[PDB]
Amino acid sequence: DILELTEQEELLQFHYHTLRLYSAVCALGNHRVAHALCSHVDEPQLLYAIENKYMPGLLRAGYYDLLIDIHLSSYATARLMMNNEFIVPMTEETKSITLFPDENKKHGLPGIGLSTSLRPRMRFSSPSFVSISNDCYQYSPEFPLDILKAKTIQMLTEAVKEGSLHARDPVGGTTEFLFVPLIKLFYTLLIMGIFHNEDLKHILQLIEPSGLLQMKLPEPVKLQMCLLLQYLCDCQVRHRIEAIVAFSDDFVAKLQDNQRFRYNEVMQALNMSAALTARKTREFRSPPQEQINMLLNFKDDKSECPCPEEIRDQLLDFHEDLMTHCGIESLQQLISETMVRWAQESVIEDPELVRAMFVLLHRQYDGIGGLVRALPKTYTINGVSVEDTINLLASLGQIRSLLSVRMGKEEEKLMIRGLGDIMNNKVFYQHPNLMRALGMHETVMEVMVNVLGGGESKEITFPKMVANCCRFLCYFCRISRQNQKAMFDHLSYLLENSSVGLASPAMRGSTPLDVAAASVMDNNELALALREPDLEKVVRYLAGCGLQSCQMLVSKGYPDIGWNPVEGERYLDFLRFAVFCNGESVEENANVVVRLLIRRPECFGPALRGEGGNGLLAAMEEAIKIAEDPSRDGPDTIHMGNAIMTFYAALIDLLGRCAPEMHLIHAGKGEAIRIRSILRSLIPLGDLVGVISIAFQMPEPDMSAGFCPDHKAAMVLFLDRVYGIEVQDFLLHLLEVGFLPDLRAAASLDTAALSX
Amino acid sequence: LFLQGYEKSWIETEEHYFEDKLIEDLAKPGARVDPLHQLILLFSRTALTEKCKLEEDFLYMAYADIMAKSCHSFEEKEMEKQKLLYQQARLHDRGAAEMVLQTISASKGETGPMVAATLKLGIAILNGGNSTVQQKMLDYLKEKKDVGFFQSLAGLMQSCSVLDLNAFERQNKAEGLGMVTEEGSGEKVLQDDEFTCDLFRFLQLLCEGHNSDFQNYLRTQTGNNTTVNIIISTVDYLLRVQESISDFYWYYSGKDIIDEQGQRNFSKAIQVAKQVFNTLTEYIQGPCTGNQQSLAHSRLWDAVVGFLHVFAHMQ
Amino acid sequence: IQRKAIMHHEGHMDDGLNLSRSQHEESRTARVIRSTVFLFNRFIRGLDALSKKVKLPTIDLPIESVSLSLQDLIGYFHPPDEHLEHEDKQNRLRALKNRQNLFQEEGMINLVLECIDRLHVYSSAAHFADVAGREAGESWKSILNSLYELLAALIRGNRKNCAQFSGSLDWLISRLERLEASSGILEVLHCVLVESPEALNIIKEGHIKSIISLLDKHGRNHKVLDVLCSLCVCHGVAVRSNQHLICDNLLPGRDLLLQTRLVNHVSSMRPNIFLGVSEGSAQYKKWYYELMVDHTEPFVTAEATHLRVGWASTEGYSPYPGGGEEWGGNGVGDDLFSYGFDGLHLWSGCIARTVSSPNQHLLRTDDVISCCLDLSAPSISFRING
Amino acid sequence: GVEIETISPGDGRTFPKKGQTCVVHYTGMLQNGKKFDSSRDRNKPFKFRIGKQEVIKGFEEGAAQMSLGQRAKLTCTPDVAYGATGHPGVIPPNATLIFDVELLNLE
């Protein structure tokens, strides 16, 4: 008999530890082992163990925790993760809680009413082993939730009845073993989306009546009590936010037609004056954010208030209702009373319990702080995209669970699948604000730093995971205007490990350096806020790649050139994206980049800068001959001549784009003249025209991984932005040497066109 | 967008007053140890638990703010001073001075919201010439000979905030053409002037009364292995802010027009410099020849020369 | 960077030798490290000279001194009391961490490992006695236990130590099967797996198989289960590979650990009838009776309805017939003192044997059974429906 | 490999046919009597198709030889139930299964 283990100390302890092992082997979202442990113990033996009054107590707690872990912990953790995200639809059920009963002498009970909020769908697969090749066995083992609900309700009633009389043998032994597992099961059940209004009323009928909070409970019991009350206030805050959105729908629906009517009235009774075009530019400009910002400010005597004063009274009524529903001037009062009483009864150990009690007391006394912390995270979407948003939330919860578990092959594959799902979810395109509210970039960055942790330059464990993460982050920053600013903070981090993923022309997209370039790309404000705590790091990386040999090509079989042109190209690409935005050169960024490049001369090519190679002419002719002779390559492959050529072209392009200007400011500023003189001393003009005059062959198709006209295009851009064409002699000269042969080669084309 | 605006400028506009009643009914011994004393002991144990970095601790950041906001024609002045002293007694007879000292020492000299809230609490606990709290702090620092508190103060004074002109020029260039955001958050030019003035006001309140013992302990920490000169750190920060003000004047020298961003940066600089000067006055007041010689044998004369120059030209 | 100092005549005006007082705690710790490394090198040299080949017994083998030194070092690294002041406990924790860091940064853990290897090269205490002597063979067990306790205490609280020596887990788990220091090896494994997440990345399938074989050999020990729990979850994160390996290699055959079932309560009824045989006065040795059933559900709640009928013996001429004790799943036929029949099988000794019969089935409703029994030559017999 | 032992006759009239979702109620157990699976525990039957390659052969080929309301003991072999690899975690390698197959409904 299992009850005989009360006296046997060995078997008691060993079975308690094997129950703890059953719990730990499937604690997190591991369902392939839960599907085994269910039958390995039983389906209804868990009920019998939580149901039996005669238990040693250790086995009782073990069986309770085992039931929680193998039947409820997965969905409990899913809801705990997606619990602070208040995603609301726009269906008519949302507009039904516009009353949020607070007036006429009633406040309501926490958890009673309508949810109408986006929550993860729960489902439990049926445990069956005669079914060979089950579909997924990924959700959870199935359990009779209703039977467990009735059983735990009646047992909680019996347990509080027994504890009210202070017996000498509580169930399982101590009052700890009596209460803690039972109230933990009840807490996770209330979490996992059961105890509808009917049963929740009966539950509150044993803690509310003014009970369970009046007994002399130990520390591990009152800790679970504090957690339960914290959830009871969390659902109340959720109801508050739902009511806020319900009222806001109709309020903004009225206000939109009100402002449209006033705009049409101005259109009709225009009556031309000087302030009319000012009102027109105010209506056209001032995007909806600052439009709402201006039309919502009336608390003092007089300020900027529009004509619709009638809706202001409704707004004041709703705000007053909100303030009287909040903690400012009975659940909050009773929770506060219980917390202060528990603190005054005796000195409390368990600093975790003390902290939980105090944060509960503080949030009950504050009330509004939950609102100002949760309103930045709430978001209403639609009544048509509900299933798409549900799929998005499910994939995000999968990503969060995979982040919680350790990284492996199957974990990496599942994370890649989840990233693909959230990229093709079709809501990522429409609502990026919701993406920032959920914090998808945050979790993806956490996954990326967990993958990158462990190795600096020796080996990057779990490859292609950082790649999928960087691609997702690139696309997230791409389809936006403020996600770039939100991600700019992580740029200072990812620039340190930006060296990974380079030296491999297989991922021109996903890379930390490329996601940095995408975050600063096409954003003047970010290009200006990009100060230099990291530009110096970038030029240091460029210097290192220009000095060393990257120790990656000698392993493949390359001739070990004394400098790396594949990482320098990417570094110069990032510097170009940071210095040249929207068609104009950022002045101070160009200045500091030039300063760093002239203080560290090893950033340029060895055959162009230094006491060795002559200049760009000889450098690029050497590059062409390296491209021509296959004896200096690696036996899709990296053509070393082409790499040197694109590196020099990217350096020339960066210098031309970091040129001061096309002389608008240079006609009056001296530092512009100094920077132009430095650029001219670096790159001469004869070198430029000689490099322009190469007369590339134009083919029977050929390969596009050689000398491409993009090099001479960058040369022309540098010549135009630094030297320019202003005198007839040099103009005709250049036109004769470089432009006529290229134009003739481009005109010699009838049908076979392979190089656009 | 309506909900975002409502969250932004409708709800957090000082719509509650509960700190005093909260501190009162937490300090009430309903019956041992009071709940407020238990909370202070919890914070002290958390600060004494040796780690590598001071955690965020939203609990502490939310409770230090409350305990600081709880605090604050002759009879009414005396009565309000006595009420302030009573509140300070209520919330420091349970060891809040030790809590502030431990939280400052457990930051290793790194600017953060925890340090900001702790300095606000120290200011609210040392408002006026409260000598009891100063004596408690001095006895604690002497009976626990630790240099971590002093090096954390030195690091904070060395890396709190200084005006820069490059960021202001970049902000000007941004607001010249970019109308997507208007750059409503005027930051990156003076990072946290609130924290800077809070730190220097905390030092001023530490040396508020003419405590020769504390004025000498802030100069030479006798009994400790290594000593750091808080006076020299303060005069160095004064020189730095003087150079920053001089550069900002050189920038705004010639156009004879000061925009609202310029005026706000001027006002923040003036407030920070005034707080630094008040701290120096509280350091040197009384016949404290130690601090007097320390200020006379430093770069204070160059700082005051530059200050006189900028004063004349700006006025 | 190694700027070797050289004493030259002229000197340069840039030395600036500033002093640091080298806190008494650190000084005492360093001198203790020196004394312990000296004594341990002495013991290692002695044991190496003894093991490599037979040598003169005129060697330095301080068995008693090294035992006392281990007993002192264990108390030196003893953790502080949990029922103490918070501030003093934190100070003692910091001092213990400093001592552990100083012992690690001077090459002491590898020294202990070398001593442990040179002690484990011998098989048993009797095997060590004839080689080292009576006292050394007597206290070799104590020395090994103290060395393993010291190795565990050096790494109990610290994390850098575990993350540094984690490469010795292969040797640890290989020596785990010495049958003699299993407790110490398991404790070291537990304290190195509970703190360092680097250790879980090098625990392969072979190590888990070896730990499970240890559980299968040494018996039921909860320390093995705690080590398995630490392997499954280290710090708030799960290892799916380790969890799957545990689930596959720990409970495939259900013999490694206890099993459990939910069985029914069965009851044994009888009339006041006793049938015994002896020489002289007998009872004709032939009896018979019948059976009908009114209502019988096949499965009342969850399992098959236990229903058997037959004849049970006793302990000679006494009451209290066969059965284990009471109230278990033991009806009739579940032991050697009982013989039962359930409709389809025959039960004798908790071993059911199948039989053939026209329309064979369980004791369903409207089933007339007839039980006959002859005592001397034949045995009991059953007739279903005639 | 698959066999059947009649436990309670089910009138021997209606038999499962190809292309039906049959309703079964089973409790399994290993060779040594250790229970490993059942359907009376979760209080719900098991609905499975015949000839759709979803249930193990030792179960489907044995259920195809039963009648409505019939109880049987189905004994399997490793090569017909799980093979030399068994079920990871539950069934050991080369384990013979025993089922109390009771036929509830035919659809």
Curated annotation (Swiss-Prot), chain C:
Post-translational modification remark: Channel activity is modulated by phosphorylation. Phosphorylation is increased in failing heart, leading to calcium leaks and increased cytoplasmic Ca(2+) levels.
Tissue-by-tissue expression: Highly expressed in heart, lung, cerebellum and brain. Detected at lower levels in adrenal gland, stomach, thymus, esophagus and ovary.
Origin: domain of life: Eukaryota
Compartmental location: Sarcoplasmic reticulum membrane
Family: Belongs to the ryanodine receptor (TC 1.A.3.1) family. RYR2 subfamily.
Written domain comment of the UniProt record: The calcium release channel activity resides in the C-terminal region while the remaining part of the protein resides in the cytoplasm.
Function text: Cytosolic calcium-activated calcium channel that mediates the release of Ca(2+) from the sarcoplasmic reticulum into the cytosol and thereby plays a key role in triggering cardiac muscle contraction. Aberrant channel activation can lead to cardiac arrhythmia. In cardiac myocytes, calcium release is triggered by increased Ca(2+) cytosolic levels due to activation of the L-type calcium channel CACNA1C. The calcium channel activity is modulated by formation of heterotetramers with RYR3. Required for cellular calcium ion homeostasis. Required for embryonic heart development.
Subunit (UniProt): Homotetramer. Can also form heterotetramers with RYR1 and RYR3. Interacts with CALM and S100A1; these interactions regulate channel activity. Identified in a complex composed of RYR2, FKBP1B, PKA catalytic subunit, PRKAR2A, AKAP6, and the protein phosphatases PP2A and PP1. Interacts directly with FKBP1B, PKA, PP1 and PP2A. Interacts with FKBP1A and FKBP1B; these interactions may stabilize the channel in its closed state and prevent Ca(2+) leaks. Interacts with SELENON. Identified in a complex, composed of FSD2, CMYA5 and RYR2.
Protein name: Ryanodine receptor 2
Record organism: Mus musculus
UniProtKB/Swiss-Prot annotation, chain D:
Keyword Isomerase listed: yes
Localization (cell): Cytoplasm; Sarcoplasmic reticulum
Record keyword Isomerase present: yes
InterPro entries per the UniProt record, alphabetical: FKBP-type_PPIase, PPIase_dom_sf, PPIase_FKBP_dom
Source organism superkingdom: Eukaryota
Domain PPIase FKBP-type: 19-107
GO biological process: 'de novo' protein folding; calcium-mediated signaling; insulin secretion involved in cellular response to glucose stimulus; negative regulation of calcium-mediated signaling; negative regulation of heart rate; negative regulation of insulin secretion involved in cellular response to glucose stimulus; negative regulation of release of sequestered calcium ion into cytosol; neuronal action potential propagation
Alphabetized UniProt keyword annotations: Cytoplasm, Isomerase, Rotamase, Sarcoplasmic reticulum
Substrates-to-products reaction catalysed: [protein]-peptidylproline (omega=180) = [protein]-peptidylproline (omega=0)
GO CC annotations, alphabetized: calcium channel complex; cytoplasm; membrane; sarcoplasmic reticulum membrane; Z disc
Molecular function, one GO term: calcium channel regulator activity
Free-text activity regulation comment from the record: Inhibited by both FK506 and rapamycin.
E.C. numbers: 5.2.1.8
Pfam families the UniProt entry points to: FKBP_C
Expression (tissue specificity): Detected in heart muscle (at protein level). Isoform 1 and isoform 2 are ubiquitous with highest levels in brain and thymus.
PANTHER family associated with the record: PEPTIDYL-PROLYL CIS-TRANS ISOMERASE, PEPTIDYL-PROLYL CIS-TRANS ISOMERASE FKBP1B
Described function: Has the potential to contribute to the immunosuppressive and toxic effects of FK506 and rapamycin. PPIases accelerate the folding of proteins. It catalyzes the cis-trans isomerization of proline imidic peptide bonds in oligopeptides.
Family: Belongs to the FKBP-type PPIase family. FKBP1 subfamily.
Subunit structure: Identified in a complex composed of RYR2, FKBP1B, PKA catalytic subunit, PRKAR2A, AKAP6, and the protein phosphatases PP2A and PP1. Interacts directly with RYR2.
Protein name: Peptidyl-prolyl cis-trans isomerase FKBP1B
